[PDB]
Amino acid sequence: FSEEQTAEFKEAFQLFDRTGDGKILYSQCGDVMRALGQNPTNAEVMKVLGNPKSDEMNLKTLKFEQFLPMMQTIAKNKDQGCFEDYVEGLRVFDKEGNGTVMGAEIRHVLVTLGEKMTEEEVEQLVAGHEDSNGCINYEELVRMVLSG
Amino acid sequence: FRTVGQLYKEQLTKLMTTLRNTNPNFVRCIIPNHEKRAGKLDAHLVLEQLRCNGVLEGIRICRQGFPNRIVFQEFR
Amino acid sequence: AQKPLSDDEKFLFVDKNFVNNPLAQADWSAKKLVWVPSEKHGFEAASIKEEKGDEVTVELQENGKKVTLSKDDIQKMNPPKFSKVEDMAELTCLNEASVLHNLRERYFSGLIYTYSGLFCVVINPYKQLPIYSEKIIDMYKGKKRHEMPPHIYAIADTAYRSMLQDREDQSILCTGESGAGKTENTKKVIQYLAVVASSHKGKQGPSFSYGELEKQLLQANPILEAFGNAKTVKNDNSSRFGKFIRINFDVTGYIVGANIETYLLEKSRAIRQAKDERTFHIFYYL
Amino acid sequence: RWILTRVNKALDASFLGILDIAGFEIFEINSFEQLCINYTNEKLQQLFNHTMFILEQEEYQREGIEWNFIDFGLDLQPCIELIERPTNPPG
Amino acid sequence: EARRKELEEKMVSLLQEKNDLQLQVQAEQDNLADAEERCDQLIKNKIQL
Amino acid sequence: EARRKELEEKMVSLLQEKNDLQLQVQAEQDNLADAEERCDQLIKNKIQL
């Protein structure tokens, strides 16, 4: 990364502290990273954190040359998707095959699959991209997730 | 005046037609003893109800058959 | 086969982890082992000694009793390999000796509701079965039926999931005779959705914060069981009204409605109950 | 009749119907009360038979899931039509 | 905002009642026909009687 | 404030629709009144016959 954007990252680190000495909680790693032009899966991060459970996930600490290498060690990346991948991967609620997507079910997948979203996380991604019957045009729901 | 039982039919059809609009789930309840009791089974008493409730045959349908349902197009 | 079970799980799923041994597999050499009629055991294993076609001098491998018995009596044996399984399916010899064998022993193994497919053959214990708790809710909570197994609950989350996917409405219907726990397996469907389908107020044994209406879903029934429930010679908490129940789910899927409907109040007793019977509970309470 | 409707008054797209039958009541003195009980009870074996066999296959057939229809000689409707049916020879 | 978002949902509740009303329409037209066939019978049996 | 009123007009529609069904219900129970009556009449009629 250039020193420029890394300075912005130095701040996005610096802000997020606890005892006042260059110390970020493991928890915050992916989220800060996400804002920093990245969407690293919890599974991706968990690899480069060393499999904590909720306890030491909440308790263990990062510092900047643990954070910034992690950022990088995901950032140069492998599979990360595009429109064509995500129209199929968001035709993912087509109910008959309809070019529009299932309202409750888009919420449920988000609770029910891998990286279990809260109710909160589910509703926010979905809401108001359905119609009266609760059909979501995914062809657009795709671009919404893929840019913003 | 119009009877209890015929008004009961004017409700029976409200019980039991809704039931043929509704997909069933079953609770196939046997009695282990005719003595009210906790824990008491009888070896012939259950065996009777294994025939009366139709178990041999009730097997040869849903033994082949599915507990879980959940919509496939969503599942794809 | 699967994750082995707790005290509560043990009553949810059968003890799926069955085992294997050389002796019963060496003994196979006695291929003339057949099951034979009995009052005391239902059936026991004996062996064909001399085949008269329609008779055989069969001999018990218990008492050693030579009993010349007919081919049509002698019910070809089933090895322990299929023992007391999760469904009433997997027994190779679908036979009298063995269908019996899988349900007789299944209630008695604690495991009342028996998957015979979807429909679960239930034998009313008249007991506080441990399989109703917020362990058995928050584990059963909207959950995947691998770990959510043969139970009035199990079918009730099959119902709760499918309905909302398929949009075909759902009924849960108990069967069988007096005091066979229709009365309860109902109030379990009630105990299921009360913290299953409903909205987590933010968010063990029975101790937990139920939702507002979902609390009332439980509390609906003890009101009715004061005003309509009466001892009999058979059941001391008998229901002196029979009823239909309904759990109306919304668009997104939570419990909106709970519709219990009465047909026949067995009012006749309210004056004069027979020997060893009680009227409606509330009287005695008041 | 007052009470159960004040109960439902507080309790009430899909629904889940459940059936607590004051049920299969073979006492000695079985009056009318006990008959029409053992009637819906009779119907309810015939609901299993009409469901896990037929309508469970017809929930399978509302779908077209691979289902071979299997019937077993368990239709009870004559014992119901005996208790139920108004005209022709009455029930 | 607040009226709008709500009108939407209450209509789905009127849809719950909507099906059930046709279910009763189905039933009352059954009951009627039950009664007509019974009356049709009693009229024609009156004649024969 | 105008989008809301479009949905309000639409509500009243579904309310009317609930009402043609609930009117047909009220047609069919009175249809059935004359029906039930006729039978119980032709039953008394039959008893004498």
User: What does the H/E/C string look like for chain F?
Assistant: CCHHHHHHHHHHHHHHHHHHHHHHHHHHHHHHHHHHHHHHHHHHHHHHC
DSSP alpha helices (H): ranges in chain B?
4-16, 43-52, 55-62, 72-75
How far off is chain C from E19, nearest CA to CA, in Å? 12
Q: What span, in angstroms and rounded, lies between the C-alpha atoms of A79 and A88?
A: 16
Which positions in chain B touch D70 (Cβ < 8 Å)? 60-61, 64
In order of B60, C182, C224, C264, D63, the CA distances from C243 in angstroms are: 31, 10, 10, 8, 31
Contact B58 C121 (CB under 8 A): yes
Q: What span, in angstroms and rounded, lies between the C-alpha atoms of D34 and D24?
A: 8
CA within 13 Å, CB half, C15: 11
The residues, ordered by sequence, that sit 6+ positions from C247 with a Cβ below 8 Å of its Cβ are C189, C190, C193, C197, C217, C255, C257, C258, D15, D16, D17, D18
Q: What span, in angstroms and rounded, lies between the C-alpha atoms of B12 and B18?
A: 10
Q: What span, in angstroms and rounded, lies between the C-alpha atoms of C283 and C155?
A: 37
Contact C251 A107 (CB under 8 A): no
Is the dihedral angle over the CA atoms A46, A49, A53, A54 positive or is it negative? negative
B56 Cβ under 8 Å from any chain C Cβ: yes
Q: What span, in angstroms and rounded, lies between the C-alpha atoms of C132 and C109?
A: 17
What are the structure tokens assigned to C236, written together? 């001391």
Q: Which of C161, C163, C166 is nearest to C148 (CA)?
A: C161
The residues, ordered by sequence, that sit 6+ positions from C210 with a Cβ below 8 Å of its Cβ are C194, C195, C201, C218
What are the structure tokens assigned to D14, written together? 């899909």
Q: What are C44's strand-pairing partners?
A: C36
From F49, which residue of chain E is nearest by alpha-carbon distance? E49
Q: What span, in angstroms and rounded, lies between the C-alpha atoms of F49 and F42?
A: 10
CA dihedral E1, E7, E9, E14 (to 10 degrees): 180
Which positions in chain C touch D11 (Cβ < 8 Å)? 213, 216-217, 220, 257-260
Contact C251 E16 (CB under 8 A): no
Contact D20 C243 (CB under 8 A): yes
CA within 13 Å, CB half, B19: 24
Q: Nearest CB to D13: which of E16, E34, E38?
A: E16
Chains with ≥3 CB–CB distances under 8 Å to E: B, C, D, F
How long, in residues, is chain B? 76
CA within 13 Å, CB half, C250: 14
Which positions in chain B touch E27 (Cβ < 8 Å)? 13-14, 17
Which positions in chain D touch C247 (Cβ < 8 Å)? 15-18
Which residue reads 């079985």 in tokens?
Answer: D30
Q: Nearest CB to E35: which of F4, F14, F35?
A: F35
DSSP alpha helices (H): ranges in A3-146?
3-14, 28-35, 42-49, 54-59, 64-75, 83-91, 103-112, 119-126, 138-146
Contact A136, A103 (CB under 8 A): yes
E-strand ranges in chain C read 33-37, 43-52, 55-60, 66-70, 75-76, 114-115, 120-123, 170-174, 229-230, 238-239, 241-249, 255-258, 261-265
> Within the 35-64 window of chain D, which residues sit less than 8 Å (CB to CB) from chain C?
36-37, 40, 44-45, 47-48, 51-52, 56, 59, 62
Decide the pairing of beta strands C238-239 and C229-230.
antiparallel
Q: What span, in angstroms and rounded, lies between the C-alpha atoms of D22 and C242?
A: 4
Q: What span, in angstroms and rounded, lies between the C-alpha atoms of F39 and F35?
A: 7
Q: What span, in angstroms and rounded, lies between the C-alpha atoms of A22 and C219?
A: 55
Contact D21, C240 (CB under 8 A): no
Q: What span, in angstroms and rounded, lies between the C-alpha atoms of F4 and E2?
A: 9
What are the structure tokens assigned to F35, written together? 């029906």
Tell me if residue C162 falls in helix, strand or coil: helix
The residues, ordered by sequence, that sit 6+ positions from C229 with a Cβ below 8 Å of its Cβ are C237, C238, C239, C240, C241, C280, C281
| Chains B–D, number of C-beta pairs less than 8 Å apart | 60
What are the structure tokens assigned to D17, written together? 């119907």
B38 Cβ under 8 Å from any chain C Cβ: yes
Which positions in chain E touch B14 (Cβ < 8 Å)? 27
D22 Cβ under 8 Å from any chain B Cβ: no
Q: Which of C52, C50, C99, C109 is nearest to C75 (CA)?
A: C99
Contact C167 D19 (CB under 8 A): no
Solving technique = cryo-EM
A12 Cβ under 8 Å from any chain B Cβ: no
The residues, ordered by sequence, that sit 6+ positions from B43 with a Cβ below 8 Å of its Cβ are C42, C104
From E16, which residue of chain D is nearest by alpha-carbon distance? D13
How far off is chain F from E25, nearest CA to CA, in Å? 6
Q: What span, in angstroms and rounded, lies between the C-alpha atoms of C114 and C101?
A: 13
E16 Cβ under 8 Å from any chain C Cβ: yes
Q: What span, in angstroms and rounded, lies between the C-alpha atoms of C183 and C7?
A: 24
Contact E23 B21 (CB under 8 A): yes
Q: Nearest CB to C164: which of A104, A112, A134?
A: A104
- What is the 3 state secondary structure string of chain D? CHHHHHHHHHHCCECEEEECCCCCCCCCCCCHHHHHHHHHHHHHHHHHHHHHHHHHHHHHHCCCCCCCCCCCCCCCHHHHHHHHCCCCCCC
C251 Cβ under 8 Å from any chain A Cβ: yes
CA A66 to chain centre: 20
Which residue reads 């398929």 in tokens?
Answer: C166
Does an H or E element contain A101, and which? strand A101-102
User: Reported resolution in A?
Assistant: 23.0
Contact C75, C34 (CB under 8 A): yes
The residues, ordered by sequence, that sit 6+ positions from C240 with a Cβ below 8 Å of its Cβ are C228, C229, C230, C265, C266, C267, C269, C280, D22
